[PDB]
């Protein structure tokens, strides 16, 4: 029973590999010979947000490019005004450990999650004038690694029990479930049209899920180690992934394989966060060696380096209008690069 | 209007700043313990004496939060990186089927050699000493080096204990000590202790180690040790 299925699976994998090699007419590094260089991008640290006590783990820019939410391990959740460097809200959390935080597209809700397996959604309306728990979600058995708001009433969550979930905030019930992974799922990224999304796990595979149907379509296995970071290219038809192997890989949704691999011989450190720019020409990658490398996303060359941090860069965020780039690290500082 | 907002945000900033200057004082004074242990061992007993469990107590007017890892997945390689800011990691192994002690040695070795856990000290309890006393009549089948082992003369025994059982105790201790000494590098230290299934002075032992860790931390700053 197992032999006729495993050998068939090996045949199907070989068929997929041969289909990829059949469509591999030329690589991205061949048809981009006559492309102008981006030159040396020398970004300057403009602001320095200093409010957190413990290490800052994750952050997420808002859709207005004005406010940003930052989550630390001290149990505080702080909302920063990027212009005036004023702390707008400080929320004390019931648990100490936080691994994810998300700022709603409308700006009404802030969600936070951690090891506690409880996703707390906070309403920023507060006509009384004090923050309060709107609703908490407890339907996971591992740890909550990443969450993102589709809209006001729907939120996608990623857990450490090899499954992803889609919640309804009003009812507090699971709409559906995503059971395709065989390892810890680290992070996810939403497409601009909020129709499809990819999820990267610790089995070196990336799954493309249909939100409405509830099934996965594609599996990309181009990495050697655990995939930590994942970010959609601004057109929604490509995405780049960052694994522990120290190489970045760019995947396409229509070519069904990798387009280019980013690597440097003097870099052997892990990748913690990636994010594209507004145009998509620059790709910002936060590495374990205390700096952020600016990769040319069509030539595989280093534009510049952001060596402002004194400790491991944990999170990187780019604004929707490309006006600034904020990086958060374990030195409890937020560096806003111009 | 343009001035009113730019005064309101100043007052909001100052109120949040004062709140963080009241909470920072609490944060920097309270110590944090991670009670990471094998399932076989009596971890629940140590806790007595959702995903994560929390214990809050105080000894000698010093606050201790001890965190019990509950219903998680066995793959530790990701979430353990959140535990590089605790004051001490308590590691408890029951000196009792598989070779659970070998798995414990491998786990301790991986924690010790971990890049992001080089600035954390580990407190070590060897549980089920009474069971070791009970095993002298009924071990040495899995360890061919127990025969070629002598009792260290610089460690005094306790009255009534069978010297063969104390030989087993010191062999188990030295197995962890060799790995701790070889790969330590002097930045962080390990502290082995003994404990029974029912004992009340262990908490005091933790206090008598945690202060020592903090003292050594200051002595790292002054370049004295």
């Amino acid at each position: 029973e197992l032999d006729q299925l495993r050998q068939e699976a090996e045949q199907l994998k070989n068929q997929i590999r041969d289909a990829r090699k059949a469509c591999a007419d030329a690589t991205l590094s061949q048809i981009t010979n006559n492309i102008d260089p981006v030159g040396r991008i020398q970004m300057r640290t403009r602001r320095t947000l200093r409010g957190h006590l413990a290490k800052i783990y994750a952050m997420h820019w808002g859709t207005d490019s004005r406010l940003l939410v930052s989550a630390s391990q001290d149990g505080k959740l702080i909302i920063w005004d990027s212009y005036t460097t004023n702390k707008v809200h400080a929320i004390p959390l019931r648990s100490s450990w936080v691994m994810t935080c998300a700022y709603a597209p409308s700006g009404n809700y802030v969600a936070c999650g951690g090891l506690d397996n409880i996703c707390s959604i906070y309403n920023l309306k507060t006509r009384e004038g004090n923050v309060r728990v709107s609703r908490e979600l407890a339907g996971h058995t591992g740890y909550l690694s990443c969450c993102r708001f589709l809209d006001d009433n729907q939120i996608v969550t990623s857990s450490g029990d090899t499954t992803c979930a889609l919640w309804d905030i009003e009812t507090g019930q699971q709409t559906t479930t995503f059971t395709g992974h065989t390892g810890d799922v680290m992070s996810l990224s939403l497409a601009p049209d909020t129709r499809l999304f990819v999820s990267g796990a610790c089995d070196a595979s990336a799954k493309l899920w249909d939100v409405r149907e509830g099934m996965c379509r594609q599996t990309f296995t181009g990495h050697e180690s655990d995939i930590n970071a994942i970010c959609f290219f601004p057109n929604g038809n490509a995405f780049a992934t960052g694994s522990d192997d120290a190489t970045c890989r760019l995947f396409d949704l229509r070519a069904d394989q990798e387009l280019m691999t980013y690597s440097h011989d003097n870099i052997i450190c892990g990748i913690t966060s990636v994010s594209f720019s507004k145009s998509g020409r620059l790709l910002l990658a936060g590495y374990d060696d205390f700096n952020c490398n600016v990769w040319d996303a069509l030539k595989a060359d280093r534009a510049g380096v952001l060596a402002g941090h004194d400790n491991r860069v944990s999170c990187l965020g780019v604004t929707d209008d490309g006006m600034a780039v904020a990086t958060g690290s374990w030195d409890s500082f937020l560096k806003i690069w111009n | 209007d343009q001035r009113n907002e730019e005064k309101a945000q100043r007052e909001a900033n100052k109120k949040i700043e004062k709140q963080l200057q009241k909470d920072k004082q609490v944060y920097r004074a309270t110590h944090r313990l991670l009670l990471l242990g094998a399932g076989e061992s009596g971890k629940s007993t140590i806790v007595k004496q959702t995903g994560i469990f929390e214990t809050k107590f105080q000894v000698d007017k010093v606050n201790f939060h001890m965190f019990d890892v509950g219903g998680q997945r066995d793959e530790r390689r990701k979430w353990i990186q959140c535990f590089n800011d605790v004051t001490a990691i308590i590691f408890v192994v029951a000196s009792s089927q598989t070779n659970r002690l070998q798995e414990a040695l491998n786990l301790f070795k991986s924690i010790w050699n971990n890049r992001w856990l080089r600035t954390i000290s580990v407190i070590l309890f060897l549980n089920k000493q009474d069971l070791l006393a009970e095993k002298v009549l009924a071990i040495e089948d899995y360890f061919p080096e127990f025969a070629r082992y002598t009792t260290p003369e610089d460690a005094t025994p306790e009255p009534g204990e069978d010297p063969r059982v104390t030989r087993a105790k010191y062999f188990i201790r030295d197995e962890f000590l060799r790995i701790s000494t070889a790969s330590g590098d002097g930045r962080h230290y390990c502290y082995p202790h003994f404990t029974c299934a029912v004992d009340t002075e262990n908490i005091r032992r933790v206090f008598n180690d945690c202060r020592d860790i903090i003292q050594r931390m200051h002595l790292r700053q002054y370049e004295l040790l």
Partner: nanobody, 126 residues
Framework: QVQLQESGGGLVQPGGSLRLSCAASGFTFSNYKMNWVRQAPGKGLEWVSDISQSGASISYTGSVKGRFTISRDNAKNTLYLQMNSLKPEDTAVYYC?????????????????????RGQGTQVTV
């Protein structure tokens, strides 16, 4: 695609000799520490032996210390296990396991809960 294909095995008598092979395809073999883990019937996973990137630092389990010989071949990226002085109590399923991270010393591969970085396994019976 990271794939491992263990090779060798069969029914042997106590006192015989047997070798193993581990085909490492789809990753940079020369930069990963690897090891052998086994599953005894009716027992949980237990560590057998390991080998570093260079091959200098080698360690075994106490029971099988001095009885087995691990050898890594970076020329053909194949891991070889030689087994001498076989015992009727060493029958188990063997797992050629890989450590997840490059250029490191620590490994976390004692997970029975569908750990994705081990092969399908091979059977040794005495």
């Amino acid at each position: 695609q990271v794939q491992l294909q263990e090779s060798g095995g069969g029914l042997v008598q106590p006192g015989g000799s047997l070798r193993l092979s581990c085909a490492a395809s789809g990753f940079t073999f020369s930069n990963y520490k690897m090891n052998w883990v086994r599953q005894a019937p009716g027992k949980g996973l237990e560590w057998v032996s390991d080998i570093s990137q260079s091959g200098a630092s080698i360690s075994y389990t106490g029971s099988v210390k001095g009885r087995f010989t691990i050898s890594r071949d970076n020329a053909k990226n194949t891991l070889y296990l030689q087994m001498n002085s076989l015992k009727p109590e060493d029958t188990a399923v063997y797992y050629c396991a890989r450590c997840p991270a490059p250029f490191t010393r620590d490994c976390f591969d004692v997970t029975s809960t569908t750990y994705a970085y081990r092969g399908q396994g091979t059977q040794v019976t005495v």
